[PDB]
Structures are given as C-alpha cells and as structure tokens.
Amino acid sequence: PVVVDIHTHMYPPSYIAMLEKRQTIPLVRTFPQADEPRLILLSSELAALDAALDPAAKLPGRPLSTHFASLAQKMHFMDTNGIRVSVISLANPWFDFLAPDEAPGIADAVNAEFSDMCAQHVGRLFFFAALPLSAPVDAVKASIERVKNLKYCRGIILGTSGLGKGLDDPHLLPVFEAVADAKLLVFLHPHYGLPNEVYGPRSEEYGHVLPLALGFPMETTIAVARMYMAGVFDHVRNLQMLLAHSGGTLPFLAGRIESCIVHDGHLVKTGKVPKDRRTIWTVLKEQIYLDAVIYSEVGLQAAIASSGADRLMFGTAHPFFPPIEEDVQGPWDSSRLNAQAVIKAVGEGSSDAAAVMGLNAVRVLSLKA
Amino acid sequence: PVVVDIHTHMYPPSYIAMLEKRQTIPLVRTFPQADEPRLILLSSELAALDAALADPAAKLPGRPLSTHFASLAQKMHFMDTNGIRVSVISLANPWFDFLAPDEAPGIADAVNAEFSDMCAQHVGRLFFFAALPLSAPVDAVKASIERVKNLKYCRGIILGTSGLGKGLDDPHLLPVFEAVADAKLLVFLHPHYGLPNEVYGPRSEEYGHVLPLALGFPMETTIAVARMYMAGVFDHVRNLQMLLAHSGGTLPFLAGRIESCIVHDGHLVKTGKVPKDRRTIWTVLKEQIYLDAVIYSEVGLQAAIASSGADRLMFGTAHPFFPPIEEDVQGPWDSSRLNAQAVIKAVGEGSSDAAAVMGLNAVRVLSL
Ligand SMILES: O=C(O)c1c[nH]c(=O)[nH]c1=O
Ligand SMILES: O=C(O)c1c[nH]c(=O)[nH]c1=O
Ligand SMILES: [Zn+2]
Ligand SMILES: [Zn+2]
C-alpha cells in the first residue's frame, strides 16, 4: 500500500540560523534551562517571550526539535509512521517577512536546497516551493519560472497575506496565472491567524490551543472565501488549490456561504449573483483539493462530501505536533489520528482509503522520477 | 409530526422605538429612497452607514426592517405558510447588551414580560427565550433570571458571546451560568460581535454582508464555546445545557482539531491540565450541547448529527433575517426550506430522526 504525506514541513539549517539572528517574529531563541531551542512564530507567543526573561516562567513558543531541520529525521519519521513518499514544504512563515531586494535570492537558494534534499532519497521525496512575495511581482514571476525548472518540485506553498493585502489582491492575479500555467499545485496554508484579542484576556492560560485549533483553520477559510468572492477561481480557471486542514472550516460552512450569497440583497440587485454563477460547491469539486489533516471522521466525512474522495489527500502536519513527551522516534499520535479518521470515514482496504492515503497524491502531483 | 422552530426572532415595537432614537449601532434609520426603515446592527456596516449619511447616492446601509421583525401576525403567517406548528421566539441581536447599566434591568424585565404576553396571544404555538441585562451588576442579572424562570411560555435564555464584557470564560459570569442552569433554563448562544473587520481585507465593502454573516458569526460562536470549554465551565456548572446557533458555528468540524491540539499542547500537558479522564469536547457536545439545524446543507448537518446525536439537533429558520430577494416575502422562504431539505437528505423523510430534528427534540427538551 502506497502512503503519501502532502502536509509535512522542514526548516533547513540555513533558514534556522537566519531566525536565530532575527529581532522580530519569526525568531528562534535558546534558553539555558531547556535543551533544544524555542521556535517563536506567532504574535500570540510574544508575552510569554517577554515573561521568560524569571526562569520559572514558562518557555515561550514551541521547541525546535531535530525533526524540523534533519532530513534523516524526516526519513526516520516516514519509516516509523509507514509513509512511502513525502511531499515536503518549507514551514510558515516561509519568505513572507524577507525584505524585497533580498527575498528572491534567498527564496531561490532555499528552494534549491529543498530540491537537493529530495535528490538524497529519489522517489520518496518531492517538494512544494515557496515564493518571495515581499518582492515586486516581476521578481515573483521570475522565481516561479525557476521552481518550475527545479527537479522534484510539484507545487507552491503560500500563506494568506499574498503581496501584503490578501489573496483577493488584483495585483496577485498574474501570480496565480503564472503558477496555474506552470502546472503547479498551490498549497494554501495558515500562519497569521486572527487578531489575538478575539481569544480574550485568559488566552495565555490555554497554551497554543486557540490560535492553532481555531485561528489557523478560520484564517484559511476567510482567505479562500475572499478569493472566491473576488472571482479568482473564475479569472484563473486552471488554478488548482490544496487547502490545509481540510479547508479550515469551508466544508462545514459552504452551505451558509451559498445561502448568504443568494440572500444578499445588495449583491443580487447589483448583478453580482448571476444565474450561471459557479457555486462554491462546484469550485470545491473542480479547483480545490483538501488535505485530510482534520483529526476526525466527522470532519473528514464532511470534507469528502464537499470535494469527493478523489480530491482528499492524507497529511500529518509533521513536525509540529510531536507526542508529549514520549517516543518522538516512535509513531506520532498526531499522524495516527488522521489515518484513523480516514479508516473510520471510508473503511480500511477500500479504494477510497487507498485514494486518500496516497494514490490521489501520486496521480494529482505526478509523484514519479 | 410536529414542526418546531427554535431559531426565530422578533423585536417588539418598544424595542424598535429605542433603536430609532439611537445615534450609534444598533439603530434603525429611515432613508428617503426606501419604503422600509434600515436596520443597522453590525460593526461591519458602520462604513456604509457613514457614507450613506454623507452621500444620498451611496448604497442603503444595513438591511431592510421588514414588518416580519415586529409583527406577531406576520410571524404566525410565516409559520402557517412554511409548515411550522410551534416557534420558540427570541429577541434578536444585540439584545440588551448595548443598554446602560442603570437602565438595563428595568428595560430587560419589561421586554421579557412583553414576550410572555405575545406568546399568550397564540396558546401552544409560541414559547420564548428571554434575554438578560448583562451590562448591569451580576445581582441585577440574577434577579432577571429569577423572573424569567417564572414567566409563562419562557423556556430559556438567549445570549451573546460578550458576557459581562470579557467573554464567556469570565469567572465573574459563573454565578450567572449557575443561576440559569439551576433555574432549568436552556442557554441559546447566538453570535453578533463577529470578528474584527480587518480580517476581511481592503475589499470588504465589495462583498455585501457575506463574510460577516457566513464566516464571522459562526466563527465567533466557535471561539466563545471553545473559551468556555477550555475554562472548564461545562464541568464547573455541570447541569448547564446550551443550544448553539447555526449548528455550533464550526464546532462539529473543528472538534477533532481542538482535541488534538489540547492533548499535544506541551504546556497544558506538562502542567497537569490534561488528565486522561477529562470530559472531552465530544462528551460535552453529546451531553450538554444542543445544536440547531440552521446550516443550509446536508454536509454540515451530518457533521452536526455525528457530533451531538440526532436526539440533540433542532430545526430552525433564522427568521426574519434572510427573506427571499426581493420577491413574495409572504410566500415560503428558501432559507427555511433549505434547512428542512438538509434534514430530509441527512436522515431520510418519514424517519424517527427526521421527526426528532424537525420538532420532537424541542418538544421534549423545552417541555412545549
Ligand atoms: O497545523 C500545522 O500544520 C501547523 C501548526 N502550527 C505551525 O506553526 N505550523 C503548522 O504548519
Ligand atoms: O443568521 C442569523 O441568525 C442572524 C444573522 N444576522 C443577524 O443580524 N441576526 C441573526 O440572528
Ligand atoms: Zn502545517
Ligand atoms: Zn439568528
């Protein structure tokens, strides 16, 4: 049985060294009272960083294990968790924070690193590239041309900020067109979350649960809905999009979105809701793929009902949710839960199981050579 | 056999009279080019309101205040023509949240008694959720709860996500939840405040009400409940029962992710906050949470049913917020019919589960 993981990240050592030299988010710090460094990515982690410098105050961020930067460690995880092929991607926030002039050069270097990592285990590793979206659109297009010509590259991973004004930014259209024409799957992934005040004044007490469990998928939903409302999928008809975490909440809210559209007085009266309009259901079946990183047959079944079994792809979200604090060199419960969600949704040994667990990814992303 | 609608709102004439006086949201305002007044409730509508006050050619702000918001005869007509036998009505958002602390108890108690009066006009076909003066001191809120407990036709409390002003995980709110639950009143949690409008980006004004209504509302509900859960409110007030607007917002879809994030949260686990015997969000969804079926899809409804059980799903319409555009409002409403069809597609017409979701659950749970 062929298992493929399309949701699995790394930070190359050069990228981590960069983060260690940074003053502002994202950054890496190393505290004396802990072994491995602290990865600090979110604005929700800022106060804990401030607080951690008594040493009895909790360590900020999350630990930067060897599973972030070691390729042997990625392969070990794959071998121990029964994964044949990984389509690896740079973790959030990618190159979003880089200065415009430096961004393309660093992106092309780091993208080439990922290609080289894939060459170490040919057949078992492909990758999503990231883009220098702080740079001019000219440079973004140039970087897109490069990753198209890098071996083992099968798509682009990107966040919700776009050029800095979201994914409904009309300046971003030529970027979507270039990627779509290059036959590169766009993997949309969260990072920026929601403004932290929505979590209220006790959010610190709940650890990372609210920003990660709610903020991330809600961010993804908002970004895709904006793309949809802006007509991006109509503009770029051959654009294909993989959505992280089974679309965030999109499968569950697709109906409410459709109802709110057709019952929007202003939009209907101003010709924004025409008779031949492609519904979000249609887009979900034609231009959107969903990963199966949803941790439940309940969510997964909604995702399957929305996009179809042939458009769902298994993922683990490695290395972000290691087991606490047991054998990290053993199987990961966070990976197992998603495999269990699939099995319970469609039945183990079913062709839908085989499709979701790897064959969809093999087919859609041409995972050969 | 009996169709019950538990998600259906009104503003009494006295409440609308308050809104017509107001400067800031919520408010009602008449513009010259429209027959119906304009109801402006949301933060996302403020830009359009300001533009319309300056520029007469700018688009009408908010939404039409139809007769279906205030008229009891229109509610009964809506019910008769959409095949609804019983409605558990409620004051619509933002309830009494906007009132000054000093004036809120008196107004809240007077309006709650008006709802009792309205229900008495059509015996057996109308019941209601009351609203609370949550801007007032907690002793005033508890006094209001004591009153609505004994109000004829009252079967629960509708409330928003703000609580006393710091959300539903506010320790100072626990006496309120305790009093409501001991009063055997069901809490109907409903959105209003949404998300900070900046999440919708610089083109937000081109998308109508879609993003705040379709995304903001359900996400707000999810965040508020998740905060209650993480704070241990459902254990601490173990007898508390909650009806969640719009099938829990997104909770059925995110319950698995929440559970995984909790058990894989380094800080929470190491600090002993995640014992193996903890009542999971699934357990709470199955024992303390009811979900309405206002989800507009069999996809969404099946997820809700799987999460809480068919015995804990209840039919609703969100009347009068999504009228047909702009055709016969006196006919059947699609926004009602869509949800009824979702139920049939999910559990099958003529089934016990269909009968349960469409009204028998509500009759049992709310003692109608
Ligand atoms: O859930 C995830 O995939 C992630 C969660 N948290 C992160 O910081 N990065 C991720 O990729
Ligand atoms: O969908 C709804 O239930 C509502 C939508 N918009 C509102 O302003 N009030 C509501 O109750
Ligand atoms: Zn991820
Ligand atoms: Zn409502």
From TrEMBL, chain A:
Pfam families: Amidohydro_2. It comes from the Eukaryota. Residues 74-366 form the Amidohydrolase-related domain. It comes from Cordyceps militaris (strain CM01). This is Uracil-5-carboxylate decarboxylase. GO terms for cellular component: cytosol. Belongs to the metallo-dependent hydrolases superfamily. GO terms for biological process: secondary metabolic process. Zn(2+) binds at residues 7, 9, 189, 317. InterPro entries: ACMSD, Amidohydro-rel, Metal_Hydrolase. Keywords: Decarboxylase, Lyase, Metal-binding, Zinc. GO terms for molecular function: carboxy-lyase activity; hydrolase activity; metal ion binding.
